[PDB]
Design a protein around this ligand. Structure first.
Ligand SMILES: Nc1ncnc2c1ncn2[C@@H]1O[C@H](COP(=O)(O)OP(=O)(O)OP(=O)(O)O)[C@@H](O)[C@H]1O
Ligand SMILES: Nc1ncnc2c1ncn2[C@@H]1O[C@H](COP(=O)(O)OP(=O)(O)OP(=O)(O)O)[C@@H](O)[C@H]1O
Lengths: 326, 326
């Protein structure tokens, strides 16, 4: 089947936004495509990290992924640093990307108007991200609009290597999520929901306890028109909710609209709060099981093991081409 | 015993000056210290290379180091890329070095007044060479006057890492060469003897056939005085010759002068042409034996293997502190 590569930043907290937005679709797609979910712990190292925290967020995230329903028999789920071929392909690639490309990388604005105290890893992580992808011949990479630009580079590098040394890499393609379900903030209906929002009430975490979920939805921003009707502009808040509610409950917006035909936001919120709680419960359970179970490690081991197998071979062929070793 | 790291750039050609200057004394040192001779092929890929040429120059250099007398049992001789820890620790160091530090590197001027068509390799190799070293808890890095600047940075990286994550690395020290002589060009006695020279007549390669060694020592510049006497200034060419001669024949300069008392350059050169031919003959022999012998690979194998045993335990502790993996 085709292959799909997904790099997951280790952050131990994914919003109901990631879930609706992409996570969910994978639980299904994982039986059709060949999927690799790499906990890129080497990329997370370019910025300060607290050793313990990082070590912890890598478990939390793997645990989570399995809970949501990723099938370790069906797909490969590994930590990035446990497959050395990654760091090796990173260097080989660092050698064919010209320095200009990295600087003209629309993200290096982190230069801080002359801060100059940035970790070189910050200017150099693209070659590594290119490695990550090219190593498994991935055909598709599910990236957001914000990323596209990086997938552009790896497309380039790949083509550059392929031409200089011979067809070896598959030129990937940046695919997006199923469109329509763009989950906005709870406190600001125009802003996208993200872990990185400074207001905790703008997002709900898969591990938010009932009470928290209830409190946050209650605070969700609405309008004063008081009618449950979909309106991208004019009625943003209500429309965001309607999307969340729908995607999770499985009802159409129209259905939800009519069903709340003569009611107001008070009851609507209370009903939504519940369908959310009802949707996370099994996840928070399974997650906790996964976290304390020794089975996690085993799944991570057989994951690396499955990854490494492919990587090793890819690296081996690269060295052959480049002309390294023996 | 103290450890000594020495990275050998694969080039398949080392000059009689390099042999005299450093190499020759290594066969001695190799008993008083713990030596690691790394054929650094990952660094050699920062600039265009022909794969076949590179694969070849890697064997050549190894065949030659043993030919010259390096004891694979006493010291460790390995290719850089056959020990993954290098490439791995490279990435971790890149994550703790500031961009400024890399740019202010007195050598990055290769950026050619706005060239930008330079591999990221040129800018980022330091973190790798820092790893090359640090990974072996080395004490002395035998460098040139010019290399010193790089040792400084790696010494820094060492400390930074030690203070942030704990005493783990050994701060290395950059020792200078033995020599007390220095070998000049054969075509220009003011220049230094080197493989990078555009005129072949300027140096003698440990693998130059006798007919060539003859033809190159003939051409060597002398003065017009016609006397074989040492004079740094005034008689540069003759002094250089006299230098090459002495070191290889164990005869003092005072002696050689007295010896050639009333003779001219004609004979002297012819004599010199011989002492060199004789000195290199066994070397070309041994070298050739190694080149067609499978024992060569077995030696590189047990080399990598001996090295990897130390490198891995270093990367393990490294990842441990950084908080990577499990
Ligand atoms: N609010 C959202 N609405 C729709 N899709 C989302 C949303 N948040 C994340 N996603 C999707 O989920 C996947 C991304 O997650 P990540 O978790 O890396 O996203 P971010 O939005 O980039 O980060 P964060 O969630 O930490 O703010 C992406 O492929 C993206 O398309
Ligand atoms: N002419 C020389 N005189 C003394 N020592 C030399 C000479 N050439 C090389 N060496 C020794 O070899 C080591 C250096 O490098 P290299 O092998 O880099 O030199 P080259 O042979 O001059 O090559 P290149 O200049 O192309 O880098 C030095 O640290 C030095 O000890």
């Amino acid at each position: 089947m085709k292959t799909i590569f997904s790099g997951i930043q280790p952050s131990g907290v994914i919003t109901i936004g990631n879930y609706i937005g992409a996570l969910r679709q994978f639980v299904e797609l994982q039986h059709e495509y060949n999927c690799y979910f790499c906990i890129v712990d080497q990329h997370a190292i370019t910025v300060w990290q607290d050793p313990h925290e990082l070590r912890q967020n890598i478990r939390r995230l793997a645990a989570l992924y399995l809970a949501v329903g990723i099938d370790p028999t069906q797909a490969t789920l590994f930590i990035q640093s446990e497959v050395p071929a990654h760091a090796q392909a990173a260097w080989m690639l660092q050698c064919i990307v010209y320095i200009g490309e990295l600087e003209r990388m629309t993200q290096f604005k982190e230069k801080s108007a002359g801060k100059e105290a940035v970790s070189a890893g910050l200017l150099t992580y693209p070659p590594l991200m290119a490695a990550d992808i090219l190593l498994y011949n991935t055909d598709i990479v599910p990236v957001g609009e914000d990323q596209k630009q990086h997938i552009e580079l790896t497309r380039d590098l790949a083509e550059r290597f392929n031409k200089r040394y011979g067809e070896l890499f598959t030129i990937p393609e940046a695919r997006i999520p199923k469109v329509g379900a763009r989950i906005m903030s709870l406190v600001d209906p125009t802003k996208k929901m993200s872990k990185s929002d400074p207001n905790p009430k703008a997002y709900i975490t898969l591990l938010d306890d009932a009470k928290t979920i209830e409190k946050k939805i209650k605070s969700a921003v609405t309008d004063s028109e008081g009618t449950i009707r979909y309106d991208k502009e004019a009625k943003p808040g209500i429309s965001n909710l309607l999307n969340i509610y729908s995607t999770l409950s499985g009802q159409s917006i129209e259905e939800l609209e009519r069903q709340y035909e003569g009611k107001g936001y008070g009851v609507f919120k209370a009903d939504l709060a519940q369908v959310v709680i009802e949707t996370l419960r099994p996840i928070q359970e399974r997650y906790h099981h996964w976290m304390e179970s020794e089975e996690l490690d085993r799944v991570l081991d057989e994951g690396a093991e499955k990854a490494n197998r492919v990587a090793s071979e890819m690296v081996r062929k690269m060295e052959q081409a480049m002309g390294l070793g023996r």
